[PDB]
Amino acid sequence: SRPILELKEKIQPEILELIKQQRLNRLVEGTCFRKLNARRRQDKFWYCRLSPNHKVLHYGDLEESPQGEVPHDSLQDKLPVADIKAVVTGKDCPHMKEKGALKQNKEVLELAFSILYDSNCQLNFIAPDKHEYCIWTDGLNALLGKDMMSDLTRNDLDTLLSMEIKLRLLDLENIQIPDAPPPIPKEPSNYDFVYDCN
Amino acid sequence: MQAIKCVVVGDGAVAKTCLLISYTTNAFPGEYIPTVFDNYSANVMVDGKPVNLGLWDTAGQEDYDRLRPLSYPQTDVFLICFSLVSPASFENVRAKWYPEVRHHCPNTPIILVGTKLDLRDDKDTIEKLKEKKLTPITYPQGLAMAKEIGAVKYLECSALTQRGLKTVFDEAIRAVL
Amino acid sequence: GQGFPSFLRNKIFIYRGKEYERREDFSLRLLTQFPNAEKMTSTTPPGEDIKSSPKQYMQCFTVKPVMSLPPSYKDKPVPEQILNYYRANEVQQFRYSRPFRKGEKDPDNEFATMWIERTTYTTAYTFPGILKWFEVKQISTEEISPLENAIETMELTNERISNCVQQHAWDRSLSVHPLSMLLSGIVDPAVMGGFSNYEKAFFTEKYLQEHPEDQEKVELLKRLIALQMPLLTEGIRIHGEKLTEQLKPLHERLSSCFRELKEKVEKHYGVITL
């Protein structure tokens, strides 16, 4: 399966772009995200909707909405995607290093993601669980045009690439791929096709 | 339909009046017309219902410390202001402005606001401050000042960019709201 | 830009926004309407390259709704409601004040260079219409000298005083805070003294070799401040009708400075009052 494996991993890009468009679709549909220490009458649920243009984010302190995203002008309908330095994950989020009233506890170590913008403004947000945290980070990194950091993303990569090549080798049933590629027979220098082209 | 009292003080070396007028004018950045009079006002919707408001523009000259306080009573919210690029402004506010404002009105929602935020990160401005031995004092110690008073908000904006300026007024008027 | 459609490329519109849209709120709203959402910064002129270049470029700014002309109302002592209706709707004319420096940029003064290149805007239809926006049908610009600039600033301040005076004059259950606002500001051209600024600007003979034949304007301004004086007088008396003890030191300052400027215009500016 060495030619098989090299062929499978060598035609990578389609699944990669496929997955990342799926990611950005998920970002656009989004959901109500989570704030910091939204306890004393603070709406911990609030939607962060990416534009279908995928350039502006529709977000802010919306109500405790179980339904999730609601289509309207959010509190802030812009996140400048052209100047997001990065999103810090984990202890790199300064809001975790807060030791006063905004002390995030040790059960949100994997839900910390602060969008860097304005070179001083951040968006320290929380995720309901790890899977969509990684999902959103993947989608943003796609907006960054970079690698994906969801374990589920690698899962999809592997399963779909394996399926795809699996459904390719039906033509080679009862045939073997020579590890050394077959020699290219000499092509006569003349291209005077005796038969008509097309 | 109602109006909101809103006072602003600060040294005359920052020209906060430019900020206020450019906001109320809805002026394009760097396009405000400087009027000849003070104490601006506007009629503002933010949430629920629109409201009026008048901005008590107060000159920072120390001699006027006898007419500034007579304006203070029944003030809904006050806005303490400074220059992010002026250490002397910091000395004034923590030494004169903040103290006496706290004494005259110890009971009013308060927000601290920066200025010349564009100049805060200006390389020429910061190098001039260094060669003049002044410090481009940054946000976190501004937050330290805020927590020192526990001002209901601290903000940083600019005139040539109007960044957060609208926001500045938004949390200003939502201090009551 | 050129990526814009046929009816949008190199086209200027006016949008009847919401009742209290801040400029950049509407700007952002339009940016939602349009990708490649950037802003050219030279608000006044177009860009000749961008007159043909792709990458659609836009710019937005609030404009002045030029007053209507309510027919058969031009001199009638009508109430304010009708005209306030006419201030916003049934409109086609729109001007934009253009700051400019023309002259020497002396430090203490700005009216050595104040020139306002207002641009009038005439659109085909009348707001409001079937569509909440319209291209400007005809564009034209204007000019304003520092003489002229002093003129409009002066007169506009005078009416603004008049409007506040009448609006409080018909309604008693009305806050006095604007009176404090306005009369304070009038009394102190505090950050800068506009009156002496006009004195140095035009009343001094220096302008009268700069503008010898254009001294028929300094007399205009002299009459303008002359007609100011009773308007401040109504301001003062209405303040007194709305005076309170906190305003009392304020009021006495207003009154003292009011007779100060009275005698000053009478002799120091030498203007003849009515």
XYZ file of C-alpha atoms in Angstrom:
649
model
C 0.000 0.000 0.000
C 3.067 2.213 -0.219
C 2.042 3.597 -3.637
C -1.485 3.559 -2.240
C -0.476 5.519 0.852
C 1.710 7.973 -1.068
C -1.122 8.536 -3.542
C -3.650 9.022 -0.726
C -1.599 11.515 1.267
C -0.290 13.132 -1.914
C -3.749 14.195 -3.148
C -4.544 15.932 0.138
C -5.828 19.396 -0.678
C -9.435 18.720 -1.662
C -10.408 17.286 1.714
C -8.502 20.037 3.515
C -10.291 22.865 1.743
C -13.545 20.905 2.001
C -13.215 20.603 5.766
C -12.295 24.248 6.159
C -15.292 25.449 4.156
C -17.374 23.241 6.404
C -15.691 24.994 9.333
C -16.467 28.459 8.007
C -20.066 27.450 7.392
C -20.190 26.380 11.023
C -18.725 29.733 12.054
C -21.335 31.600 10.011
C -24.243 29.659 11.476
C -22.429 29.850 14.841
C -24.322 29.921 18.133
C -24.617 31.895 21.358
C -21.084 32.142 22.754
C -19.981 32.517 26.388
C -18.610 35.487 28.344
C -16.446 35.790 31.464
C -17.985 35.439 34.935
C -21.522 36.109 33.700
C -23.116 35.346 37.068
C -24.838 38.397 38.608
C -27.521 38.995 35.970
C -25.161 38.809 32.995
C -26.263 37.163 29.763
C -23.682 34.377 29.440
C -25.372 33.344 26.188
C -24.924 35.722 23.252
C -24.655 35.086 19.526
C -21.495 35.707 17.496
C -22.534 35.473 13.843
C -19.996 35.635 11.057
C -21.130 37.452 7.960
C -22.016 35.252 5.003
C -19.369 37.506 3.473
C -17.039 36.041 6.133
C -15.502 39.414 6.939
C -17.545 40.772 9.850
C -18.707 39.098 13.045
C -22.128 39.830 14.533
C -21.534 39.618 18.263
C -21.947 41.281 21.625
C -23.881 40.910 24.861
C -27.114 39.419 23.627
C -29.709 37.899 25.938
C -29.718 34.422 27.487
C -31.148 32.978 24.282
C -31.480 29.163 24.274
C -32.297 29.197 20.545
C -28.792 30.512 19.880
C -28.077 32.873 17.015
C -30.784 35.408 16.169
C -30.511 37.425 12.935
C -30.241 41.115 13.825
C -27.640 43.824 14.415
C -25.691 42.515 17.394
C -24.103 44.750 19.999
C -21.017 44.939 17.788
C -21.371 43.798 14.190
C -17.678 44.137 13.330
C -14.621 42.122 14.211
C -11.787 43.367 11.994
C -10.591 40.154 10.423
C -7.767 41.870 8.530
C -5.896 42.794 11.722
C -6.540 39.929 14.147
C -3.063 39.156 15.455
C -4.159 35.781 16.854
C -6.461 34.143 19.382
C -4.704 33.062 22.563
C -5.710 29.683 23.981
C -5.233 28.653 27.598
C -2.859 30.422 29.971
C -1.885 32.883 27.225
C -5.314 34.443 27.781
C -4.636 37.275 30.261
C -8.164 36.911 31.646
C -7.087 33.632 33.227
C -4.159 35.491 34.820
C -6.766 37.748 36.442
C -6.514 37.397 40.221
C -9.300 39.740 41.346
C -13.018 39.717 40.566
C -12.724 38.181 37.076
C -10.872 35.063 38.300
C -11.607 32.267 35.861
C -11.333 28.929 37.670
C -9.482 25.771 36.612
C -12.410 24.175 34.726
C -12.210 26.721 31.881
C -8.546 26.094 31.008
C -9.666 24.684 27.648
C -12.485 27.173 26.969
C -10.282 30.289 26.871
C -9.954 32.063 23.535
C -9.262 35.795 23.290
C -9.377 37.426 19.867
C -6.547 39.932 19.472
C -7.469 43.246 17.859
C -6.754 46.976 18.134
C -3.384 45.783 19.557
C -4.879 46.199 23.053
C -8.507 44.991 22.857
C -9.229 41.301 23.357
C -12.278 39.031 23.369
C -11.898 36.588 26.268
C -14.706 34.155 25.530
C -15.729 30.718 26.753
C -17.036 27.674 24.900
C -19.738 25.286 26.166
C -17.342 22.370 25.621
C -14.057 21.451 23.970
C -15.297 20.189 20.606
C -16.854 23.455 19.431
C -14.062 25.426 21.093
C -11.643 23.643 18.777
C -14.202 24.049 15.981
C -14.329 27.830 16.334
C -10.558 28.062 16.657
C -10.213 25.964 13.497
C -12.624 28.243 11.671
C -10.797 31.370 12.781
C -7.438 29.870 11.817
C -9.024 29.240 8.428
C -9.890 32.930 8.412
C -6.203 33.224 9.271
C -5.609 30.751 6.437
C -3.666 28.432 8.725
C -3.650 24.895 10.117
C -6.533 23.327 12.038
C -6.381 22.579 15.760
C -9.426 20.377 16.281
C -8.859 16.707 17.015
C -12.187 16.119 15.280
C -10.701 17.887 12.250
C -7.911 15.309 12.035
C -10.574 12.640 12.532
C -12.510 13.918 9.525
C -9.316 14.260 7.488
C -8.385 10.642 8.080
C -11.838 9.083 7.725
C -12.809 10.929 4.561
C -9.441 10.539 2.836
C -9.532 6.816 3.635
C -13.097 6.519 2.337
C -12.252 8.413 -0.815
C -9.249 6.313 -1.778
C -11.219 3.263 -0.633
C -13.894 4.039 -3.211
C -11.156 4.571 -5.811
C -9.421 1.174 -5.680
C -12.484 -0.621 -7.010
C -10.965 -0.333 -10.483
C -7.714 -2.015 -9.381
C -9.450 -5.033 -7.843
C -7.346 -8.148 -8.467
C -4.540 -5.839 -9.666
C -1.314 -4.668 -8.032
C 0.424 -1.285 -8.073
C 4.157 -1.747 -8.791
C 6.107 0.097 -6.115
C 8.431 1.223 -8.873
C 6.130 2.994 -11.350
C 5.767 1.234 -14.696
C 8.301 2.412 -17.276
C 7.059 5.051 -19.693
C 7.267 3.490 -23.188
C 9.082 5.535 -25.788
C 6.794 8.016 -27.514
C 7.634 8.461 -31.215
C 8.790 12.025 -31.764
C 6.289 12.583 -34.572
C 2.831 13.706 -33.455
C 1.347 13.051 -36.917
C -1.759 11.333 -35.571
C -2.753 8.925 -38.342
C -6.289 9.060 -36.963
C -8.085 12.365 -36.521
C -7.818 14.167 -33.194
C -10.642 14.431 -30.641
C -38.310 62.181 26.750
C -35.561 63.337 29.096
C -32.109 64.906 29.292
C -28.892 63.819 30.999
C -26.321 65.923 32.833
C -22.739 65.163 31.841
C -19.708 67.169 32.941
C -16.183 66.965 31.542
C -13.049 68.476 33.061
C -9.369 68.345 32.181
C -6.349 70.475 31.478
C -6.468 72.806 28.517
C -3.400 71.104 27.051
C -5.395 68.213 25.549
C -8.331 70.035 23.904
C -11.043 67.576 24.898
C -13.410 70.161 23.427
C -12.243 68.950 20.023
C -13.331 65.436 20.959
C -16.728 66.582 22.191
C -17.476 68.808 19.212
C -16.310 66.248 16.659
C -18.594 63.713 18.297
C -21.656 65.951 18.442
C -20.908 67.363 14.998
C -20.743 63.770 13.733
C -17.707 65.220 12.017
C -15.497 63.323 9.648
C -12.142 62.773 11.375
C -9.966 65.857 11.201
C -12.858 67.879 9.781
C -14.501 69.519 12.792
C -15.293 73.230 12.735
C -14.219 74.786 16.053
C -17.071 76.921 17.324
C -16.523 79.907 19.622
C -18.630 78.640 22.535
C -18.695 75.832 25.040
C -21.088 73.476 26.864
C -22.216 71.307 23.982
C -25.326 69.125 23.933
C -27.094 66.460 21.873
C -30.231 64.295 21.689
C -29.322 60.631 21.887
C -30.900 57.253 21.348
C -28.960 54.311 22.694
C -31.490 51.818 24.073
C -35.198 51.832 24.810
C -35.874 55.522 24.200
C -33.893 58.507 22.924
C -32.766 61.121 25.427
C -31.391 64.628 25.405
C -28.061 65.420 27.003
C -25.868 68.424 27.615
C -22.112 68.223 27.935
C -20.833 70.506 30.685
C -17.594 71.581 29.019
C -15.457 72.962 31.841
C -12.180 74.805 31.350
C -9.371 73.251 33.356
C -7.766 76.514 34.465
C -7.118 76.267 38.190
C -8.551 79.709 38.932
C -12.014 78.521 37.829
C -12.161 76.090 40.750
C -14.852 78.422 42.138
C -17.226 78.240 39.165
C -16.616 74.631 38.234
C -18.119 73.261 41.510
C -21.347 75.272 41.277
C -22.076 73.303 38.104
C -21.390 69.989 39.859
C -24.666 69.517 41.818
C -27.324 67.154 40.430
C -24.891 65.837 37.823
C -26.075 62.506 36.445
C -22.598 61.351 35.385
C -19.208 62.994 35.197
C -16.398 62.194 32.776
C -12.869 62.629 34.049
C -10.412 63.013 31.188
C -6.680 63.284 30.557
C -4.029 62.841 27.860
C -2.612 59.340 27.502
C 0.614 60.916 26.222
C 0.980 63.514 29.009
C 2.571 62.347 32.274
C 1.914 65.857 33.579
C -1.775 65.290 32.857
C -1.559 62.129 34.952
C 0.051 64.058 37.780
C -2.704 66.661 37.531
C -5.561 64.169 37.502
C -4.323 61.871 40.262
C -3.167 64.935 42.214
C -5.713 67.675 41.489
C -8.524 66.608 39.159
C -9.465 63.218 40.596
C -9.112 64.298 44.263
C -11.142 67.506 44.173
C -13.731 65.994 41.837
C -14.124 63.147 44.311
C -14.463 65.637 47.163
C -17.022 67.880 45.471
C -19.079 64.925 44.207
C -18.162 61.723 46.060
C -21.483 60.225 44.895
C -21.829 60.034 41.089
C -21.013 57.388 38.457
C -17.608 58.192 37.006
C -15.651 57.087 33.939
C -12.024 57.855 33.129
C -11.074 58.350 29.488
C -7.773 58.561 27.653
C -6.915 60.822 24.751
C -4.494 60.929 21.825
C -4.634 57.144 21.724
C -3.351 57.427 18.166
C -0.413 59.351 19.615
C 0.015 56.797 22.413
C 1.604 54.362 19.951
C 3.114 57.087 17.749
C 6.811 56.270 17.403
C 7.831 59.901 16.942
C 5.702 60.990 19.888
C 7.027 58.271 22.191
C 10.636 58.958 21.184
C 10.063 62.663 21.830
C 8.672 61.832 25.269
C 11.720 59.669 25.972
C 14.186 62.336 24.842
C 12.122 64.825 26.862
C 12.034 62.230 29.671
C 8.265 61.799 29.644
C 6.649 58.383 29.531
C 4.082 57.077 27.035
C 2.077 55.709 29.942
C 0.031 52.723 28.824
C -3.349 51.130 29.514
C -2.660 48.798 32.479
C -1.679 51.602 34.833
C -4.691 53.525 33.593
C -6.653 50.483 34.716
C -4.759 50.717 38.001
C -5.984 54.302 38.371
C -9.505 53.158 37.529
C -9.426 50.382 40.126
C -7.922 52.913 42.535
C -11.143 54.856 42.195
C -13.158 51.888 40.984
C -14.582 54.099 38.248
C -17.504 52.303 36.634
C -15.521 52.311 33.386
C -12.182 53.363 31.942
C -11.757 54.038 28.231
C -9.171 55.246 25.720
C -10.018 57.081 22.507
C -8.657 59.485 19.895
C -9.829 62.503 17.925
C -8.294 61.960 14.491
C -9.739 58.426 14.539
C -12.858 58.698 16.762
C -12.145 55.103 17.776
C -14.311 53.996 20.683
C -15.342 57.630 20.915
C -18.939 56.750 20.131
C -18.471 53.825 22.490
C -17.032 56.213 25.086
C -20.273 58.175 25.042
C -22.292 54.944 24.942
C -21.001 53.629 28.253
C -21.043 57.219 29.477
C -24.794 57.508 28.997
C -25.402 53.910 30.039
C -23.646 54.653 33.332
C -27.025 55.987 34.417
C -28.602 53.279 32.268
C -14.022 52.365 -8.221
C -14.971 50.245 -11.177
C -16.198 46.997 -9.642
C -19.373 48.899 -8.839
C -22.332 48.214 -11.141
C -23.170 50.523 -14.023
C -25.564 52.647 -11.966
C -23.149 52.804 -9.022
C -19.693 53.408 -10.494
C -18.466 56.943 -9.779
C -21.889 57.828 -8.394
C -22.802 59.921 -5.364
C -25.985 59.265 -3.422
C -27.684 60.704 -0.377
C -29.293 58.319 2.078
C -32.243 59.214 4.291
C -30.930 57.256 7.236
C -32.666 56.482 10.495
C -33.644 59.227 12.911
C -30.461 59.038 14.980
C -27.839 57.117 13.028
C -24.345 58.218 13.937
C -22.275 58.599 10.791
C -20.141 55.507 11.195
C -23.106 53.373 12.243
C -24.589 53.962 8.806
C -21.110 53.576 7.346
C -20.864 50.108 8.874
C -24.392 49.297 7.744
C -23.391 50.102 4.177
C -20.222 48.063 4.609
C -22.505 45.152 5.411
C -24.301 45.946 2.162
C -21.004 45.852 0.292
C -17.897 43.696 0.465
C -14.509 45.268 -0.311
C -15.639 47.699 2.368
C -12.952 50.374 2.617
C -13.037 54.145 3.023
C -11.236 56.754 1.013
C -10.094 59.509 3.339
C -10.125 62.569 1.041
C -13.785 63.174 1.759
C -14.161 66.044 -0.692
C -12.742 65.001 -4.079
C -13.006 61.793 -6.094
C -9.986 59.768 -7.133
C -9.086 59.962 -10.810
C -7.364 56.588 -10.715
C -10.364 55.274 -8.783
C -12.619 56.945 -11.335
C -11.567 53.945 -13.442
C -9.765 51.546 -11.100
C -11.434 48.404 -9.741
C -11.734 47.735 -5.991
C -14.907 49.715 -5.312
C -14.188 52.756 -3.153
C -16.758 54.648 -1.115
C -16.930 57.502 1.368
C -19.724 58.666 3.653
C -20.440 61.772 5.691
C -23.414 63.585 7.151
C -24.754 66.476 5.096
C -26.806 69.515 5.886
C -30.495 69.271 5.043
C -31.126 72.680 3.525
C -34.376 74.075 4.887
C -37.542 73.819 2.864
C -39.472 76.906 1.755
C -42.908 76.452 3.334
C -45.109 78.386 0.919
C -47.075 81.314 2.318
C -45.037 81.009 5.528
C -42.015 83.168 4.711
C -43.010 85.944 7.125
C -45.996 84.535 8.987
C -45.473 84.150 12.769
C -46.113 80.414 12.496
C -45.348 77.980 15.338
C -42.229 75.854 15.283
C -43.768 72.427 14.639
C -44.577 73.103 11.009
C -41.093 74.367 10.238
C -39.432 71.490 12.095
C -41.396 69.207 9.806
C -40.063 71.328 6.972
C -36.524 71.107 8.342
C -36.245 67.414 7.467
C -38.712 66.491 4.744
C -39.584 67.718 1.262
C -35.912 68.426 0.699
C -33.527 68.396 -2.249
C -30.792 70.897 -1.346
C -27.783 69.830 0.694
C -24.613 71.640 1.673
C -21.428 70.452 3.334
C -19.119 72.782 5.227
C -15.513 72.499 4.061
C -12.726 73.523 6.461
C -9.755 75.085 4.738
C -6.601 77.058 5.484
C -6.090 80.109 3.271
C -3.647 82.680 4.635
C -1.045 82.693 7.373
C -1.343 80.058 10.099
C -0.728 82.344 13.044
C -0.771 80.427 16.354
C -3.294 82.290 18.512
C -5.703 82.720 15.597
C -7.418 80.568 12.991
C -9.542 83.119 11.118
C -6.474 84.231 9.209
C -7.151 81.039 7.228
C -10.772 79.958 7.802
C -12.357 79.318 4.423
C -15.462 77.169 4.010
C -15.819 75.591 0.583
C -19.394 74.492 1.046
C -20.776 72.184 -1.620
C -24.473 72.324 -2.415
C -26.221 69.117 -3.461
C -29.406 69.073 -5.521
C -31.081 65.715 -6.022
C -33.732 64.883 -8.585
C -36.450 64.012 -6.083
C -37.613 65.069 -2.629
C -36.867 63.154 0.518
C -38.700 61.238 1.625
C -39.549 59.259 -1.487
C -40.345 55.782 -2.761
C -36.656 55.012 -2.195
C -34.799 55.973 0.953
C -31.862 57.236 -1.094
C -31.122 59.102 -4.284
C -28.130 60.077 -6.345
C -27.285 63.755 -6.263
C -28.668 65.079 -9.529
C -26.525 68.219 -9.608
C -23.420 69.059 -7.584
C -22.017 72.513 -6.924
C -19.514 73.976 -4.483
C -19.142 77.373 -2.827
C -16.590 79.536 -1.031
C -16.571 81.382 2.297
C -14.047 84.042 3.298
C -13.055 84.561 6.969
C -15.117 87.716 6.694
C -17.905 85.603 5.303
C -17.106 82.866 7.839
C -17.493 85.256 10.712
C -20.739 86.242 9.039
C -22.426 82.849 8.974
C -21.052 81.829 12.357
C -22.283 85.081 13.856
C -25.756 84.918 12.341
C -26.227 81.208 13.065
C -25.336 81.771 16.691
C -27.840 84.616 16.771
C -30.650 82.453 15.495
C -29.672 79.512 17.716
C -30.170 81.916 20.601
C -33.501 82.904 19.079
C -34.663 79.297 18.718
C -33.803 78.411 22.299
C -35.511 81.602 23.488
C -38.773 80.928 21.656
C -38.837 77.215 22.485
C -38.594 78.014 26.169
C -40.895 81.015 25.701
C -43.911 78.945 24.668
C -43.301 76.059 27.080
C -42.668 76.811 30.752
C -42.286 73.177 31.889
C -38.961 73.128 30.100
C -35.471 72.459 31.430
C -33.224 75.448 32.130
C -30.063 73.414 31.582
C -29.797 74.506 27.909
C -30.023 78.110 29.052
C -27.071 77.489 31.367
C -25.305 75.759 28.456
C -25.819 78.483 25.898
C -25.569 81.594 28.023
C -22.452 80.276 29.716
C -20.842 79.625 26.349
C -21.926 83.001 24.973
C -20.567 84.844 27.999
C -17.177 83.141 27.801
C -15.562 82.603 24.459
C -13.357 80.940 27.011
C -10.903 78.745 25.117
C -10.624 81.632 22.639
C -12.207 85.076 22.459
C -14.168 85.206 19.235
C -15.151 88.848 19.587
C -11.629 90.216 19.915
C -10.727 87.691 17.234
C -13.056 89.505 14.850
C -11.632 92.807 16.071
C -8.098 91.788 15.137
C -9.389 90.047 12.012
C -11.369 92.826 10.326
C -11.974 95.770 12.668
C -8.250 96.472 12.820
C -6.974 98.548 9.933
C -4.590 95.750 8.918
C -7.526 93.988 7.297
C -8.534 97.326 5.823
C -5.418 97.353 3.729
C -5.892 93.634 3.154
C -9.551 94.409 2.363
C -9.855 98.184 1.865
C -12.784 97.973 -0.522
C -13.883 94.907 1.445
C -14.589 96.905 4.567
C -18.238 97.063 3.590
C -18.148 93.641 5.253
C -16.745 94.758 8.591
C -19.731 97.095 8.815
C -21.942 94.110 8.040
C -20.432 92.286 11.018
C -20.780 95.435 13.106
C -24.492 95.538 12.380
C -24.648 91.795 12.989
C -23.264 92.125 16.513
C -25.440 95.206 16.971
C -28.454 93.006 16.265
C -26.839 90.358 18.470
C -27.054 92.663 21.461
C -30.840 92.580 21.993
C -30.803 88.847 21.303
C -28.418 88.380 24.195
C -30.753 90.703 26.079
C -33.645 88.288 25.583
C -31.306 85.482 26.554
C -30.462 87.275 29.799
C -34.047 88.161 30.668
C -35.358 84.678 29.915
C -32.532 83.328 32.055
C -33.755 85.611 34.815
C -37.276 84.275 34.353
C -35.692 80.825 34.740
C -33.009 81.927 37.207
C -32.092 79.919 40.298
C -29.658 80.427 43.159
C -27.053 78.151 41.586
C -27.524 80.196 38.414
C -27.548 83.381 40.495
C -23.749 83.887 40.515
C -23.917 82.665 36.960
C -26.633 85.203 36.199
C -24.785 88.130 37.730
C -21.691 87.240 35.725
C -23.870 87.048 32.618
C -25.442 90.408 33.408
C -22.204 92.206 34.267
C -20.448 90.898 31.175
C -23.627 91.699 29.235
C -23.524 95.393 29.994
C -19.766 95.123 29.507
C -20.227 93.948 25.923
C -23.079 96.458 25.651
C -20.870 99.460 26.324
C -18.028 97.826 24.386
C -19.994 97.457 21.171
C -21.442 100.922 21.757
C -18.022 102.597 22.043
C -15.163 100.074 21.891
C -16.507 98.509 18.714
C -18.293 101.828 18.186
C -21.329 100.129 16.673
C -24.719 101.834 16.832
C -27.391 99.732 18.526
C -31.147 99.851 18.029
